[PDB]
Design a protein around this ligand. Sequence first.
Ligand SMILES: COc1cc(/C=C/c2ccc(O)c(OC)c2)ccc1O
Ligand SMILES: COc1cc(/C=C/c2ccc(O)c(OC)c2)ccc1O
Ligand SMILES: [Co+2]
Ligand SMILES: [Co+2]
Ligand SMILES: [Mg+2]
Ligand SMILES: [Mg+2]
Lengths: 483, 483
Amino acid sequence: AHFPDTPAFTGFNAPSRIECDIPNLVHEGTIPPELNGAFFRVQPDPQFPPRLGDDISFNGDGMITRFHIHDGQCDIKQRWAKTNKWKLENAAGKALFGSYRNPLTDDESVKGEYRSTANTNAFVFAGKLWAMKEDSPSLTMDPATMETFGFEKFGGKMTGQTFTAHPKVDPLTGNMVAIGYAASGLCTDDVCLYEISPDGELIYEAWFKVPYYCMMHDFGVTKDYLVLHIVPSIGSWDRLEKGLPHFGFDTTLPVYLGIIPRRADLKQEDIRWFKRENCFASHVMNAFQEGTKVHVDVPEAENNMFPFFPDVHGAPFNPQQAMSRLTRWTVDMASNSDEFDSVTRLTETAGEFPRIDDRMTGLPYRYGWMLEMDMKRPVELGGFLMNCLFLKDHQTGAEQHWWCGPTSSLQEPAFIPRSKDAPEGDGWIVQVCNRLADHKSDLLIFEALDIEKGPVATVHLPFALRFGLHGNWANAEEIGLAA
Amino acid sequence: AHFPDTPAFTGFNAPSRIECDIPNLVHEGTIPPELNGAFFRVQPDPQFPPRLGDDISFNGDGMITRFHIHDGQCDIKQRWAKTNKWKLENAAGKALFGSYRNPLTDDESVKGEYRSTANTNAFVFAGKLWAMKEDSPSLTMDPATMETFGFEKFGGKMTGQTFTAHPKVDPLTGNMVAIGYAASGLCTDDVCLYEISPDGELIYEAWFKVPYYCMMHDFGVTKDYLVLHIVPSIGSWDRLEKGLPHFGFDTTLPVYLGIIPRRADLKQEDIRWFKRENCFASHVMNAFQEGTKVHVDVPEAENNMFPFFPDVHGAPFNPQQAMSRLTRWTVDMASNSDEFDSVTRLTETAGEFPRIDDRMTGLPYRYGWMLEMDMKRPVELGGFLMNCLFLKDHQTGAEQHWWCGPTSSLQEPAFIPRSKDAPEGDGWIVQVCNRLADHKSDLLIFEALDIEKGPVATVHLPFALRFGLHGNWANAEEIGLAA
Ligand SMILES: COc1cc(/C=C/c2ccc(O)c(OC)c2)ccc1O
Ligand SMILES: COc1cc(/C=C/c2ccc(O)c(OC)c2)ccc1O
Ligand SMILES: [Co+2]
Ligand SMILES: [Co+2]
Ligand SMILES: [Mg+2]
Ligand SMILES: [Mg+2]
């Protein structure tokens, strides 16, 4: 394959496209013998060169990595998420879909097809592996064989066109809670709220509209509510016609937080929109209720964090204003005005990729993990450099940091509970480490509440993973692997 | 897996064990559209840590790499050669066989099993892929699926215990010509000569004895003769009982060249042994007859080339005396004495891994390729450093060199003929290049008689191959791949 000689395809961003199997990877330390299950993660990875001769990282085809941990060892199985795009381009031997979220650049032969790369999350629910991309229904796969099933439209009960890559699981019911924005077509202001039973059936689909179309990448869920931030990374057909990236950031638009009842009978009038001054937030650590209030914790930045989705008025990217810090947004459903109740920075540590013990989804909670950017650490070989694992204790305020060293960077952590009813945070953290000087990757295993001593086990891969997005652990009994 | 922290298992020698599939590898330059077939090669690669807690490179399990070149692109498929050793240890989840060629160190549960790692050649013949190791019958595999069949004993017609890793194909008949030393048991002085028809049937097996047991790794074949050098890398049960490496080099023993008739009715008395002073030679570029004379071209060194098979009298390894240079050994079957007719150095270039256009096997020939060690080139990051591809023209004497640069090394080349009846050397050379600074490998494609301009195509693998031994190209129609 002849790939472009541009930053998105060279160095750490070289195409990999490895499908492989390796049991009993070389490792150091002690893999806890309690672990019996697998950690799934996804990397964008282009099957074919881009039609345009350049592209962005978020547009690569989804390649799924599974780390099966059992009997004190770690195995890897890596397979493509065989979206309709993947299958059509594989059959044609060339790229047919074009630029990111831009149907105007597709070959006429794929007009009207789902454009999904399934490249943003690898999630486990209802016995299936979900390979997810927010512009289409989710792909599903067999979590044991990692064969692909197809797109999940819930027996025709789903009429929205899209499905999130950030599903939540409500611990009170076991339901998956999801959204789908641009639900009636590209750049529309319609959004769907979905709840899926543990058995994989769509319980309900509720439609509503938002203040303006924008990237609704993540959200929060509480007992009673969908918690939906409205942040002005905006897109338009006009932008696409002019050849611009789909999204661009508008510093002049307000930010909203919508509180949407989790009810099949939802009506537009039941929603409250709270309003604040312009800022940037993408991911949600967790949300929960307290009396008549709703709290949501997000990494907040002063300005845009996506340099490839540039300032719509032509401003150059500002790296310092892109620094995000975990911040609690509080709104009161009994308040008179549309103002936030409070905005409170929870740490001075800069970070992203926030995670929790997911059994606390929607509940008051004590622990949060993040990828941290410590600009004061040496780097002995641009972009965001995520060089630490970070743990925050909301009860005492204590913070823990682990630095991966001067030639490495880190990918998103994932929490593994010790058992169904273990206390919050009783378990382990796994995460990929980019060993940039060795052009390879490790899987690190930490004791989740004691990270400053470093990982208790380091699993070496004999090749490099690419930049990853989101990933999750599932116990073996949830994914058809051995007891 | 917990592997030892020793040189044979770290750095470039880290275990890999990757089984994978990747079509349409990222590449540069122009892959000739004439190419339709595959290049097979093998790397020792340990499935499990060694029982002893250390080992040598030559004892790793055979991992087979196939580069399928077609339609101007290159695909890779890599699979284990599933020897009986591989299968037994896989089932047990641990190493059961011990040190190199040392049955005294095996677990009692595998007493009497073939110890083969099938790690020395990946050869194509009679529609099968041969994964070869000189201490046992050859393994065979499906060249298209790269599944394993098992050990080839030719319907019971083979009674020798061993089969070479350096088979030759006689262009006059299409027969495979092979030997098997230590044919009646470990360290015995019996050798078998085998010829196999193009249909895969054993034509004949002829037994004889050699002057002393030693590593009979390679050999030559002419129209009338097996040409067998006797070089004193010797082994013994006594060495094994004392815990020494199986082989050690004895500088005090003579070197012989045996001329053995290629005949099923062979008798010991039909053999001529020519004798010369001590030296080291392992591989054979080619052998051929001229009147009553036999010529064989080998890389000759003053002393031992295997530091892990040390001098039997305790001398430290001598790197300078291990430098090998292509040398023609000539003997005359009509001569009165046992002296060589001539010993003539053919180049001052130091090199090994000699190859020819294999259609000239056993015939007078013009071209030879080697891996070259140019000690005068910069190395910007011990062992042999093979840093050039080398081509020798026996007709004019001309020499060509291509240097892979200061941070790379090279593996064995293989010649690809343009067509069945193209002139000698009309075709291409393929070879793996170790990109040591990038911790990855390339496959290089050269115009076979014009190498100084560099490869015409460079295929990038997104991971590193390990040290390889021998490999071969086969046209697609010979290995069940598409026309
Ligand atoms: C600062 O917030 C982060 C965001 C992201 C990516 C979001 C994302 C959005 C849309 C996509 O279509 C997509 O597809 C791959 C990805 C990654 C890391 C972060 O820290
Ligand atoms: C200097 O001659 C060379 C020899 C070799 C290896 C021979 C070999 C011998 C016995 C084995 O059992 C084996 O198993 C892996 C390998 C490799 C490169 C060279 O240049
Ligand atoms: Co995300
Ligand atoms: Co050899
Ligand atoms: Mg269904
Ligand atoms: Mg047979």
